[PDB]
């Protein structure tokens, strides 16, 4: 999407994001009896229990996307998009986000609304 | 679309995904870029950097198995008894009547 990134750059960005997400969800896992989180090989699994269901969040490297499956709202696909220019016209000052280009929403926003997790 | 309890769903889904896993473990040995994992009701099938990653997961509140394919996108499979067919239930995408086994045959070349 908006960001002009190589596959290697994608992997770094996605790994950084999912590592941060994982540690936030590990906190949630400790506080709640119904929440279990796993992470292996680019795939983050979040079982919210028998009433909520299971979330899957995974790297899709050929598309340079992060894909999502939600039991509340279904499937979505996130591109790495530059939403803020930052300090300069320089691309190294730009703020990038994971955005679902069908509606412009962010992955952070979905997690906040559905799971109460603020990344 | 079958009238089953949540406990029955879990048994049926676990049986199916266990069978699928062992078929994919054979495939893992015979193809260098294929890796399969199965944990907490989620089957991950990484076909490497050109093909991408398949996810196949239980979605218990809907009594479905959900799929995400890098070639053809998301689908939701119900446990369905069709009256075409006899024996001495199948996992079906009810939008077109196809089975999950058929998709895996066509996309990945695994004949289940």
Automatic annotation (TrEMBL), chain A:
Its main location: mitochondrion. One of its GO terms (cellular component) is mitochondrion. One of its GO terms (biological process) is iron ion transport. It is found in: Mitochondrion. Its EC number is 1.16.3.1. It catalyses: 4 Fe(2+) + O2 + 4 H(+) = 4 Fe(3+) + 2 H2O. It is an enzyme of class 1 (oxidoreductase). GO terms for molecular function: 2 iron, 2 sulfur cluster binding; ferric iron binding; ferrous iron binding; ferroxidase activity; iron chaperone activity. It comes from the Eukaryota. Keywords: Coiled coil, Ion transport, Iron, Iron storage, Iron transport, Mitochondrion, Oxidoreductase, Transit peptide, Transport. Residues 11-38 form a coiled coil. Belongs to the frataxin family. This is ferroxidase. The lineage of its organism: Eukaryota, Fungi, Dikarya, Ascomycota, Pezizomycotina. The chain holds residues 87 to 203 of 210 of the full protein.
């Amino acid at each position: 999407s908006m960001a002009d990134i190589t596959t290697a750059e994608y992997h770094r960005l996605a790994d950084e994001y999912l590592d941060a997400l994982l540690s936030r969800l590990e906190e949630l896992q400790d506080e709640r009896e119904d929440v279990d989180v796993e992470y292996q090989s680019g795939v983050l699994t979040l079982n919210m229990g028998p009433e909520v269901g299971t979330y899957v969040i995974n790297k899709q490297p050929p598309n340079k996307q992060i894909w999502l499956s939600s039991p509340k709202s279904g499937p979505k696909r996130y591109d790495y998009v530059i939403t803020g220019e930052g300090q300069n016209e320089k691309q190294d000052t730009a703020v990038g986000e994971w955005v679902y280009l069908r509606d412009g929403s962010t992955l952070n926003q979905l997690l906040l609304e559905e799971i109460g997790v603020d990344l």
